[PDB]
Symmetry: C2
Subunit: 193 residues, 2 copies
Amino acid sequence: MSNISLIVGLGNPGSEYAQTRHNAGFWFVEQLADKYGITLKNDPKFHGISGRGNIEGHDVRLLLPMTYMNRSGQSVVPFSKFYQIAPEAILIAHDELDMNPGVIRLKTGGGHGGHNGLRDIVPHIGPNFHRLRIGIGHPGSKERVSGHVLGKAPSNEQSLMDGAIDHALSKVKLLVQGQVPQAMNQINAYKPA
Amino acid sequence: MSNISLIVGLGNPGSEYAQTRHNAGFWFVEQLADKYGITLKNDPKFHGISGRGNIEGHDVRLLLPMTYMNRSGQSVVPFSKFYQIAPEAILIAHDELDMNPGVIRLKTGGGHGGHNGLRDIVPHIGPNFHRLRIGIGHPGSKERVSGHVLGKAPSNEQSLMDGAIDHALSKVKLLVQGQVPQAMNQINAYKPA
């Protein structure tokens, strides 16, 4: 329904990618799973890692595609179809070039904005899912983007992103209770202390 | 039996990885394919891009896994099984952290040496295939490895690697004509300085 029932984290599998900026979505959903004591388990049928449990009085599914970023739809699409989860009840957390470290915003609908993980999802389920856009900064040219997203942020930038993620984690109650405009106001207002 | 009939290049799919050090094996096989006018085509059955043609009077197959590096066995294994090509007839080109840019060596057997592409192949076909080890240099600590292999080499290092690949290319006649010891002597003698 209006309630967010499925929270997806985008990123790449394996310890060599775990700390890279392109894994911002993974950071959010891994931290959310442990905050609520939801176990993320290997889910090879849906080419991901997935979990289910109570978040703030609602039964919520958590998914990390293990397809690699540009093939995320190979996990998200059959998973959401098998469980008959409408896009409107999906939140996809991802790295956002177009926002700085320590900026974080909740968006509903629109396109992929050149994000190759969203590019593999929008065609299949349509655009009407929610996104948690975790700012990672833009390095200032197209050519520098790959090294940036596949790079580890320096600690001052990582702390800015970690603070924005912590803030967003504290608003998931509004999202799973279906209070999306209140979640949007409260997430988007975030500024580093 | 001693003739190389299958040449594999290891690497990651997509333009964002094409110039990264981890794609050294792709560089070698792409350059080999165009040297001999061998078209590399989509081969979804074997989760790769593949070609076939005449190299120096021999029918040789070329394979670029499109699995991502750590899943290269998902292509190499079923491909080698389907064409019934034994390990001793396989040459796998890959990036080598433990050799400097401009160093290039042909090796027969042994293990993966922590290369996560070889790690996904050795368990299934065993160790008795040949390897073209393309030096890419070592960034000097385990934590720096991922940024190094998923990074684009500076022009000076790229020139060294390119000259080594060019030299290896000059020796493929010996490999496909079943003169492996001669190819190993002549490849491993390459001096980038």
